[PDB]
Design a protein around this ligand. Structure first.
Ligand SMILES: [Mg+2]
Length: 210
DNA sequence: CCCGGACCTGTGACAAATTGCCCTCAGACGG
DNA sequence: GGCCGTCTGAGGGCAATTTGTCACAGGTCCG
């Protein structure tokens, strides 16, 4: 299945995209990299890749696409929009999109790589972003270890504001995304909390390959 | 000594959002 | 050439789960 690669600058960028948007984003990077910024998506190809019907695919593409308008990307700073023109459909089952051409160099650069079958069953988008940031440190054999700062997690994954109270952070973000990865990917993940006084400051992740 | 206050934790409620499903009907194409 | 049956996909919806928010009880330490 397709091998995604992207600059580490994209893995660690600050942005908020949905699952459907992130899925499409994987195909743009694949299309662009296999070569002006104009990409294309076929309904019937999307449906076969992610095991959806044509009807629900059409809905996913359509609603994801109109929700890109106004979205921005921050590299740590400098902010850019994803699209510089609305999408449009010349043919039935076919959509044409205009990626901000200034984003091209950020896609292809110190890089991150994973096969698309590894992430395509994940549902929660924060769990996608986390799996991407563990892959950035993975070793050939499939293991690694990394410490991420909690304030840095919140800015980069653009977690919603109420998750600045740590018990909500634990309950609705951390536990679920550790759970999904262990249930939906070929990776076995564990973690431990680093404290300073009463405050929890970092999260320390360990993983291997099954 | 014990207090209110400033921190921290987990859980129960409710509100807001998303998931995979279902149903209709016209477009595009090949037979 | 030209009509129709079939495969697509662009819409309209649902209930069951997931995600996002906050009140409230109960731990610590300090002045
Ligand atoms: Mg869908």
């Amino acid at each position: 299945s397709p091998r995604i690669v992207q600059s580490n600058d994209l893995t660690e960028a600050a942005y908020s995209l949905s699952r459907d948007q992130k899925r499409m984003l994987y195909l743009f990077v694949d299309q662009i990299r296999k070569s002006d910024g104009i990409c294309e998506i076929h309904v019937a190809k999307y449906a076969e890749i992610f095991g959806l019907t044509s009807a629900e695919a059409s809905k996913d593409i359509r609603q994801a696409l109109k929700s890109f308008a106004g979205k921005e990307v921050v590299f740590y700073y400098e902010s850019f929009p994803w699209f510089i023109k609305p999408a449009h459909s010349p043919s039935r089952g076919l959509y044409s999109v205009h990626i901000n051409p200034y984003l091209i160099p950020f896609f292809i650069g110190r890089f991150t790589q994973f096969r698309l079958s590894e992430t395509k069953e994940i549902t929660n988008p924060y769990a996608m972003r986390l799996y991407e940031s563990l892959c950035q440190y993975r070793k050939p054999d499939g293991s690694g270890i990394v410490s991420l700062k909690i304030d840095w997690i919140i800015e980069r994954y653009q977690l919603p504001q109420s998750y600045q109270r740590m018990p909500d952070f634990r309950r609705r973000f951390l536990q679920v995304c550790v759970n999904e990865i262990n249930s939906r990917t070929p990776m076995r993940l564990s973690y431990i909390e680093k404290k300073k006084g009463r405050q929890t400051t970092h999260i320390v992740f360990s993983f291997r390959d099954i």
